[PDB]
Amino acid sequence: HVHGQVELNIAQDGHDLLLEITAPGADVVGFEHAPQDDAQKQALEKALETLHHPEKLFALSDKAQCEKREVLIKHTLGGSFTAQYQFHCEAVDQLKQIDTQWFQYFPSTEKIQANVLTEKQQSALQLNAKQTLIKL
Ligand SMILES: [Zn+2]
Ligand SMILES: [Zn+2]
Ligand SMILES: [Zn+2]
């Protein structure tokens, strides 16, 4: 649990695209404590509302016909967020890459450690706000 670091595990199995996020609360909300005031209350609500749009946090090509099947959000109060997302991509052959928008929604994240398991290969890469491409 390192502030500014986010864990990203992507699994691709047939039409199943599963992405899991482990993010410190400092990255997602801007602080890991109980909301002191209304500003912080809004920060938390904005975050939680953002976390249920993995289709905004991960740019999936329309051609891949990716539909959201699962949105799980776990907040543990330090403080941590786990999000687990499942897409069913009816043209998964056309999902060449994912362009993560994480750094745009949560700019206090500096690096994501991405693990990508597909039918063909495991691969790792470190992402930043400028290098957001994941190849499948
Ligand atoms: Zn929403
Ligand atoms: Zn912490
Ligand atoms: Zn299918």
Numbering used by the authors: 35 to 111, 123, 185 to 242
Sentences from the paper on this structure:
Thus, the ZrgA proteins appear to represent a newly discovered family of zinc SBPs widespread among Gram-negative bacteria, including human pathogens. Here, we have determined the crystal structure of ZrgA from Vibrio cholerae and characterized its zinc binding in vitro and function in vivo. ZrgA adopts a ferredoxin-like fold, albeit with different topology from the classic ferredoxin (fd), that bears no similarity to known SBPs. Here, we show that ZrgA likely functions as the SBP for the ZrgBC permease/ATPase transporter system as it is required for normal growth and survival in zinc-deficient conditions in the ΔznuA background.
Since zinc-bound ZrgA would not crystallize, zinc was soaked into crystals of apo Δ124-184 ZrgA to acquire the holo protein structure at 2.41 Å resolution. We also acquired a dataset at the zinc absorption edge to generate an anomalous density map, which allowed us to model a total of 21 zinc ions into the asymmetric unit. These fall into 5 different binding sites. Sites 1 and 2 are observed in every chain with strong anomalous density and relatively low B-factors for the zinc ion. Site 1 is coordinated by the previously disordered His 35 and His 37 as well as Glu 66. Site 1 is conserved in PA4063 where a fourth His aligning with His 184 in ZrgA coordinates the metal. Site 2 is observed on the long alpha helix and is shared between two chains, one containing ligands Glu 83, His 86 and His 87, the other contributing Glu 79. Site 3 is located at the opposite end of the protein from site 1 and is coordinated by residues His 49, His 194, and Glu 196. Although the structures of apo and holo ZrgA are very similar with RMSD ~ 0.5 Å, they do reveal a few interesting conformational changes accompanying zinc binding, particularly near site 1. Further, the loop containing Glu 66 moves approximately 4 Å to allow zinc coordination.
